[PDB]
């Protein structure tokens, strides 16, 4: 699925 | 933990709760240091603010001032007799010479009632032209400005059934050798006006007691530019008040304290500048020589120019011994003093 | 290490992001440490923490300092084409470190806004209440409330294995088309992080603006209308225009997750823009020492005293 | 004729100086040259009493050497227990402007005064509930700067009208007036036998008064600026004066001369308080640079420094038994050292 | 003025007749007292912590 890899 | 240690902590805990309540209630207090010149109407200035700030006077409270009323009439007249000897003005009537000795004999403290032999003594001297001429020269020697008021009201003061009117109360002065405080409760904050004009000791010993004050109130009379006092080497009173103003500002204690500069007796300046000139007492003055508003602004500028800091704010007001806005001006100047201090600590200003 | 597939794995993988972004992170880290740490010295040594203002200004400097601490970790994670070599326990902490401190930085600025409003618009009545104890209670409640907002981050954040590219990333997984719990993270940043804090900041500085106009016109004595009013406009607008790009793209990512947005042509820009908007959200942390510090006269003279002691 | 009297006074002053110049064989420094130095003095703050809201201006130890009373300008008179740091009494004063405080030797009374020109006596024991004001000693015309309990019914006060007085608390009227000074009297110290007492004034002179006869016996004139503190040597034949000159000077009653001067080039701040040790070897002095100094009273060399106050140290006392020293400062905190 | 002068010369002539002993005799008595009571001074010679009423 959506992989949100950002710091914040 | 013995039995005794229990009661010791019970007593200690009761005290710590009381100290917490007093610490909470002390946040509502503000200390203002009041510094009168001396000739200024400092007494009538404070009493006026108490009348306008509610309160009032009652017959019980009034009867206390009755003894002071009579005492003031003697002092008033006695100072006139002493000047006769100095200004070398003799009496028009020979009868007054004897009457003058009686007035010198009177002891102000011993006075407790006004008796017939003293009524005449004082009435007769007021009638004498020499004394009236000495009264007219009231600038040369320290004399009450309210003598005419009471001496024209001598008939009611003389009567045994006498009650001072609110106006008599306002003018009468109570002597003080120590600090007296006047609390004004404006609901939001209670002001503690600390009057230290009558300490009569070295100032360096007790000046540090007011290191954290919010503001300093200076009461100066505008009608002192021609009142050369003969006790010293014929020195102008305005110069002495300026020296006192300059000295107080330069103290390192009041580096964080604002200054409220009340200028008193502006109505008397208007009446007296008609026949008196400011340029011959202060050569730096350059005005119409007949305007009462040009002199006011010039006198104010001399006092403000004495401040070297350029960061200490000086608030100025003109009082005419009957202004009803004195307490409201102090609230506005103190509120504005707190606001600027808040801005500085927030790094906004 | 759980094994999953990335829905569209080419989003945000550009050459100019793997070099420019780690440079910005390092630059902000150097500047932010130099600035914020300087402020903490001044408040403890010269202001001496005798006033409520000191308590709030110290916490704001502390929150910005701690947010920058874990920045080098994300700088090298982005440098190596998004590969996490630090292990699960480190991504658990590093994700929480950024979210916790950033939430506290925003919440503290709201507290300064309300606290400044009381001390300026009501200088007389606030003296009874604005005591040191109330400052301590407010500060600890702020940090506790930031921890509860940052808690979903420390829970969902986890290391994953991307079978599509054989790359170990640590991130949040939106496995469901609804996935209500992870999207509560998205809306909390949007509502509890921008709207409510900005409405309070806007309201308080607007009422401060009116009061200073009335106060300066009544006295009319040597007023410095320029400096006080420039700072209020600078403070309010800088907060808005340094946080609004990130909150816009956070909202878009919420729409992507729900299913409203499905095309990867614009899921590519969203993952491309997000590193940029995080860089300029840290501008607050590296510039707060200026706006809330040295724009006043007191800190300027304190720094000159430090300069003399070299 | 005025010139004849002042010339006679000048001749008498010349005779006074000549007599001293004669009985000046050797200085105290020369006699104590071959003596063992005290060394370094290490004192640590055993206690720290908190509870005052504003600056502390005076403290006085009880005779039992465990209870001490302190005065602050917040309007509180607090009695502490040194051992357990428990407050025994918290008296609210009518005027918050207080500059002095005293503790009765019997332990039943305390006294205080200040810019109100009045000395108030508070009864501690036998008064159920709140302690009440037993007496209002009035009659001074300046701020009251020191008071010391001679007995339970006799207190000696010094004021800013350049005069000292001896009061009878029961009657309320002053019994004797000691007026020879030409400046503000700032300090007052009683002899161990309570038959003599020295006073320091702002005219940079100290005088020895006889309590019963009420006359000035000797005048000591070594200081340049104003004297802030004074204290008897335990033997009773000497006393030490601290002044704004940043120097402490020792005087001897029988020699009628200044013996030694305790000064340092670094010290430029005024001296606020002074006290002696039980043996008289250590002379403690509080300063305006926020710390106290301990001096070897026989060699005039510094032996220690009592730091730990961040504002001016205003008061300083040593217990009767010599166990502890209590210093209070404008930081609103008292500290007991050992 | 004149009255104050009369009092001052009276005080100065009254102050003159007090015989003054030599400093060496006086200075010796200061040393004699300090040595006799040196042991009893607790601040001069630190007391063992067992018999210290402060800090146990
Ligand atoms: C912070 C505000 C001003 C937005 C800044 C956006 C900047 C940092 C981003 C957005 C668009 C990005 C550009 C997009 C495309 C390229 C092409 C590449 O071959 C060189 C880098 C370059 C030129 C990027 C440089 C950085 C860039 C300009
Ligand atoms: C990195 C930033 C955010 C924090 C550190 C900023 C410091 C280094 C900068 C910002 C404000 C600058 C000050 C601005 C104004 C003056 C006034 C001048 O008469 C002396 C230098 C002084 C005091 C500058 C010193 C350096 C200064 C304090
Ligand atoms: C449990 C964690 C995740 C959230 C709560 C953190 C709390 C307990 C910690 C973190 C920040 C700390 C604050 C940091 C700075 C100050 C100001 C200083 O004068 C001491 C009190 C105070 C206010 C501290 C109180 C305790 C504090 C608020
Ligand atoms: C947008 C929001 C989340 C920012 C933070 C606002 C809240 C958390 C802050 C702003 C106002 C702060 C309050 C200010 C005053 C007090 C009074 C004190 O006696 C208890 C704490 C309390 C009640 C603080 C609690 C935390 C508080 C309510
Ligand atoms: C986050 C990036 C875009 C930086 C944005 C900074 C902007 C929003 C801030 C920083 C400097 C601030 C300016 C500082 C000074 C003034 C002068 C005043 O008379 C009008 C407002 C104005 C012009 C402020 C407007 C807002 C401002 C321009
Ligand atoms: C300076 C403040 C006020 C606004 C900054 C907006 C910046 C952070 C945001 C807004 C729009 C974003 C852009 C949106 C779309 C793209 C397309 C992509 O292929 C390169 C990055 C780029 C160009 C983003 C760069 C960052 C960006 C420019
Ligand atoms: C990843 O690993 C698998 C084996 O597990 C291999 O077949 C594949 O080629 C590798 N690379 C990619 C891009 O899948």
Of E11, E16, E41, nearest to D180 by CB-CB distance is E11
By C-alpha distance, the chain B residue nearest D80 is: B12
Count of Cβ atoms closer than 10 Å to residue D103 Cβ = 24
Work out how many CB contacts closer than 8 A connect B with D. 68
SS (H, E, C) D51-76: CCCCCEEEEEECCCCCEEEEEECCCE
Determine whether the interchain pair D215/E14 forms a contact, defined as Cβ–Cβ distance below 8 Å.
yes
Same domain? B76 vs B124: yes
Helix B94-105 and helix B116-127: axis angle, to 10°? 130
Greatest Cα-to-Cα distance within chain B, rounded to the nearest angstrom: 90
Whether residue B5 lies inside any domain: the answer is no
Sheet holding D155-159, edge to edge: D144-149, D155-159, D164-167, D174-178
Whole-angstrom distance, CA of residue D18 vs CA of residue D5: 20
Residue B348 to residue C127, Cβ atoms within 8 A? no
Is residue B160 located within the same domain as residue B190? no
* Distance between A6 CA and the closest CA of chain C, angstroms: 7
- Rounded CA Rg of chain D: 20
Q: Are C108 and C60 in contact (CB under 8 A)?
A: yes
Angle CA(D249)–CA(D250)–CA(D252) in degrees, nearest 5? 145
The last residue of one of the domains, among B126, B145, B171, is: B171
Q: For residue B88, how many other CB atoms are within 10 A of its CB?
A: 7
DSSP C118-142: HHHH-TTTHHHH--HHHHHHHHHHH
Comparing CA positions, the residue from D304, D281, D293 lying closest to residue D35 is D281
Q: Whose CA is nearest to atom 23 of ligand 4?
A: C138
Of C191, C154, C172, C155, give the one whose Cα is nearest residue C2. Answer: C172
Do B164 and B190 fall into the same domain? no
Q: Is C226 exposed, middle or buried (0-12, 13-18, 19+ CB in 10 A)?
A: exposed
Q: Closest residue (by CA) to atom 6 of ligand 6? A: C245
Q: Which residues of E touch D26 (CB under 8 A)?
A: 23-24, 27
Q: C296 vs B348: CB contact, 8 Å cut-off?
A: yes
Which residue owns the Cα nearest ligand 1 atom 6?
C276
- Domain CATH number, residue B107: 1.10.400.10
Q: Measured between CA atoms, how close is D301 to chain B, in angstroms?
A: 30
Which residues partner with B270 through β-bridges? none
B122 and B205 both lie in a single domain: no
User: How many domains, chain B?
Assistant: 2
Q: Structural domain of residue D118, as residue ranges? A: 2-337
Pure H helices in C122-195: 126-129, 132-156, 180-190
For chain B, what percentages of helix, strand and coil (3-state, to nearest 5) are there? Answer: 55, 10, 35
DSSP label at residue B108: T
Residue B149 CA to residue C118 CA, distance in Å, equals: 50
B86, B92, C215 from B95: Cα distances, Å: 20, 9, 65
For residue D55, give the CATH number of its domain.
2.130.10.10
Residue that the structure tokens 């700030």 belong to: B53
Tokens of B111: 């006075």
Resolution (A): 2.9
CB distance B179–D53 less than 8 Å? no
Same domain assignment for residues B197 and B225: yes
How far from chain centre, in Å, is Cα D209? 15
- The reply to whether B4 falls in a domain is no
Please tell me if the CB atom of residue C59 comes closer than 6 angstroms to any atom of ligand 3.
yes
Compute, in angstroms, the gap from residue C119 CA to the centroid of ligand 3: 23
Report d(CA B102, CA B17) in Å as an integer: 62
Q: Which ligand is nearest to the CA of C242?
A: 5
Which residues of chain B are within 8 Å of residue C57 when distances are taken between CB atoms? 347
Helix (H, G, I), strand (E, B) or coil at B344: helix
B16/D115 Cβ within 8 A = no
Contacts of B127 (CB under 8 A, 6+ apart): none
What does DSSP say about strands B228-229 and D164-167: parallel, antiparallel, or unpaired?
Answer: unpaired
Structural domain contains residue B342? no
Tally of domains in chain C? 1
Distance D316 CA to ligand 7 centre (A): 84
Which among C23, C13, E26 is positioned nearest to D27, based on CA atoms?
E26
Do at least 3 CB pairs under 8 Å connect E with A?
A: no
Q: Could you tell me which residues come within 8 angstroms of residue B132 by beta carbon, excluding any fewer than 6 positions away?
A: B126
Domain that holds residue B127: 59-171
Pairing of strands D257-262, D227-232: unpaired
Is residue C132 lining ligand 4, measured as CB closer than 6 Å? no
CB D68 within 8 A of CB D78: no
If asked whether residues B304 and B324 sit together in one domain, one would say yes
User: E29 at the D interface (CB within 8 A)?
Assistant: yes
C-alpha closest to that of B223 among B36, B35, B41, B34 = B41
Pocket flag, ligand 4, residue C113 (CB < 6 Å):
no
Q: What is the CA radius of gyration of chain E?
A: 23
SS3 breakdown of chain D: % helix, strand, coil, rounded to 5? 5, 45, 45
Q: Look at residue B349 and tell me if it is in a domain.
A: no
Is residue B220 within 8 A of residue B262, CB to CB? The reply is yes
Q: How far apart are CA D274 and CA D206, in angstroms?
A: 15
Measured between alpha carbons, how far is B217 from B257 in angstroms, rounded to an integer? 10
**Which of C119, C127, C221 lies closest to B346 in CB terms?**
C119
Residue-range definition of the domain harbouring residue C223: 1-310
Query: A–B contact (≥3 CB pairs within 8 Å)?
Result: no
Pair of tokens at residue B97? 């010479």
Q: Which residues of C touch B347 (CB under 8 A)?
A: 57, 292-296, 298-299
Distance between CA atoms of residues B296 and B273, nearest Å: 11
Number of domains in chain D: 1
Cα–Cα distance measured from residue B177 to residue B183, given in angstroms and rounded to the nearest whole number = 19
Tell me C193's DSSP state. I
Q: Which of C70, C249, C191 is nearest to A4 (CA)?
A: C249
Ligand 5 pocket: which of C233, C276, C279, C295 to mutate (most atoms <8 Å of CB)? Answer: C233
Clarify whether residues B197 and B315 are in a common domain: yes
Residue found under tokens 């008796």? B115
Answer yes or no: are the C-beta atoms of D324 and E54 closer than 8 Å. Answer: yes
CA nearest to C253, candidates C192, C196, C172, C197: C172
**Tokens found for residue B276:** 């008196």
Burial class from Cβ neighbours inside 10 Å (0-12, 13-18, 19+) for residue B253 reads middle
State the distance from the centre of ligand 4 to the C-alpha of B25, rounded, in angstroms: 24
Contact E21, D13 (CB under 8 A): no
């Amino acid at each position: 699925g959506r992989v949100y890899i950002h710091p914040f | 933990l013995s039995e005794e240690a229990k009661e010791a902590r019970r007593i200690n805990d009761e005290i710590e709760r009381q100290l917490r309540r007093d610490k909470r209630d002390a946040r509502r207090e503000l200390k203002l240091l009041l510094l009168g010149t001396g000739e200024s109407g400092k007494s009538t200035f404070i009493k006026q603010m108490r009348i306008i700030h509610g309160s009032g006077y009652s017959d019980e409270d009034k009867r206390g001032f009755t003894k002071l009323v009579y005492q003031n009439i003697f002092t008033a007249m006695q100072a006139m007799i002493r000047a006769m000897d100095t200004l070398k003005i003799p009496y028009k009537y020979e009868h007054n010479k004897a009457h003058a000795q009686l007035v010198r004999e009177v002891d102000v403290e011993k006075v407790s009632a006004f008796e017939n032999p003293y009524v005449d003594a004082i009435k007769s001297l007021w009638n004498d032209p020499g004394i009236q001429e000495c009264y007219d020269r009231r600038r040369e020697y320290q004399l009450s400005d309210s003598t005419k008021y009471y001496l024209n009201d001598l008939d009611r003061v003389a009567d045994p059934a006498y009650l001072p009117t609110q106006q008599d109360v306002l003018r009468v002065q109570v002597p003080t050798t120590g600090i007296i405080e006047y609390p004004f409760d404006l609901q939001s904050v209670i002001f503690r006006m600390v009057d230290v004009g009558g300490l009569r000791s070295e100032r360096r010993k007790w000046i540090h007691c007011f290191e954290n004050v919010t503001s300093i109130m200076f009461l100066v009379a505008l009608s002192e530019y021609d009142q050369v006092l003969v006790e010293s080497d014929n020195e102008n009173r305005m110069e002495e008040s300026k020296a006192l103003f300059r000295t107080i500002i330069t103290y390192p204690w009041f580096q964080n304290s604002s200054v409220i500069l009340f200028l008193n007796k502006k109505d008397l300046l208007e009446e007296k500048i008609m026949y008196s000139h400011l340029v011959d007492y202060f050569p730096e003055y350059d005005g119409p020589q007949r305007d009462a508003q040009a002199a006011r602004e010039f006198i104010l500028k001399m006092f403000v120019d004495l401040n070297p800091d350029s960061d200490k704010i000086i608030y100025s007001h003109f009082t005419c011994a009957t202004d009803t806005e004195n307490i409201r001006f102090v609230f506005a100047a103190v509120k504005d003093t707190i606001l600027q201090l808040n801005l500085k600590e927030y790094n906004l200003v | 290490i759980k094994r999953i597939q990335d829905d569209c794995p080419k989003a945000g993988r550009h050459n100019y992001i793997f070099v420019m972004i780690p440079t910005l992170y390092s630059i902000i880290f150097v500047v932010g440490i130099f600035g914020n740490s300087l402020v903490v010295i001044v408040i403890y040594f010269y202001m001496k923490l005798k006033t409520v203002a000191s308590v709030f200004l110290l916490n704001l400097a502390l929150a910005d300092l701690c947010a920058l601490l874990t920045l080098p970790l994300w700088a090298v994670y982005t440098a190596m084409e998004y590969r996490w070599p630090f292990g699960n326990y480190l991504c658990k902490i590093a994700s929480a470190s950024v979210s916790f401190n950033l939430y506290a930085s925003v919440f503290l600025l709201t507290c300064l806004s309300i606290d400044r409003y009381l001390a300026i618009v009501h200088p007389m009545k606030s003296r009874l209440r604005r005591t040191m104890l109330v400052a301590k209670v407010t500060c600890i409640i702020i940090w506790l409330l930031a921890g509860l907002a940052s808690l979903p981050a420390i829970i969902h954040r986890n290391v994953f294995f991307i079978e599509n590219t054989n790359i170990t990333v640590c991130a949040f997984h939106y496995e469901s088309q609804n996935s209500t719990l992870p999207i509560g993270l998205g809306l909390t940043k949007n509502i509890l992080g921008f709207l409510f804090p900005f409405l309070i900041i806007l309201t308080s500085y607007t009422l401060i603006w009116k009061a200073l106009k009335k106060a300066y016109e009544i006295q009319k004595n040597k007023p410095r209308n320029d400096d006080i009013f420039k700072i209020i406009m600078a403070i309010v607008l800088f907060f808005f225009f340094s946080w609004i790009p990130h909150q816009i793209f956070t909202f878009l990512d919420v729409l992507i997750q729900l299913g409203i947005i499905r095309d990867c042509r614009i899921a590519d820009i969203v993952d491309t823009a997000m590193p940029i908007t995080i860089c300029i959200a840290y501008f607050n942390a590296c510039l707060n020492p200026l706006f809330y510090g040295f724009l006043g006269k007191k800190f300027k003279r304190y720094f000159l005293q430090l300069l003399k002691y070299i | 004729e005025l010139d004849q009297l002042r010339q006679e006074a000048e001749q008498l002053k010349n005779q006074i100086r000549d007599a001293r110049k004669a009985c000046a064989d050797a200085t105290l420094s020369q006699i104590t040259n071959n003596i063992d130095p005290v060394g370094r003095i290490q004192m640590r703050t055993r206690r720290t009493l908190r509870g005052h809201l504003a600056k502390i201006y005076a403290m006085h130890w009880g005779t039992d050497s465990r209870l001490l009373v302190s005065a602050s300008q917040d309007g509180k008179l607090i009695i502490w227990d040194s051992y357990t740091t428990n407050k025994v009494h918290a008296i609210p004063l009518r005027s918050s402007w207080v500059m002095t405080c005293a503790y009765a030797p019997s332990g039943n009374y305390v006294a205080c005064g200040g810019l109100d020109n009045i000395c108030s006596i508070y009864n501690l024991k036998t008064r159920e509930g709140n302690v009440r004001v037993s007496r209002e000693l009035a009659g001074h015309t300046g701020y009251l700067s020191c008071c010391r309990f001679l007995d339970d019914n006799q207190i000696v006060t010094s004021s800013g009208d350049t005069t000292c007085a001896l009061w009878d608390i029961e009657t309320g009227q002053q019994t004797t007036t000691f007026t020879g000074h030409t400046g503000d009297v700032m300090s007052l110290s009683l002899a161990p036998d309570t038959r003599l007492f020295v006073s320091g004034a702002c005219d940079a002179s100290a005088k020895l008064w006889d309590v019963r006869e009420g006359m000035c016996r000797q005048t000591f004139t070594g200081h340049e600026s104003d004297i802030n503190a004074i204290c008897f040597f335990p033997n009773g034949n000497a006393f030490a004066t601290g002044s704004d000159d940043a120097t402490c000077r020792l005087f001897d009653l029988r020699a009628d001369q200044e013996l030694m001067t305790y000064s340092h080039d670094n010290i430029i701040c005024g001296i606020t308080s002074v006290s002696f040790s039980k043996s008289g070897r250590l002379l403690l002095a509080g300063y305006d640079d926020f710390n106290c100094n301990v001096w070897d009273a026989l060699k005039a060399d510094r032996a220690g420094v009592l730091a730990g106050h961040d504002n001016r140290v205003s008061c300083l006392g040593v217990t009767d038994d010599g166990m502890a020293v209590a210093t209070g400062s404008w930081d609103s905190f008292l500290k007991i050292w050992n | 003025s004149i009255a104050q002068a009369r009092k001052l010369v009276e005080q100065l002539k009254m102050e003159a007749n007090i015989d003054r002993i030599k400093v060496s005799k006086a200075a010796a008595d200061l040393m004699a007292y300090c040595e006799a009571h040196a042991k009893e001074d607790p601040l001069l010679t630190p007391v063992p912590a067992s018999e210290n009423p402060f800090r146990e």
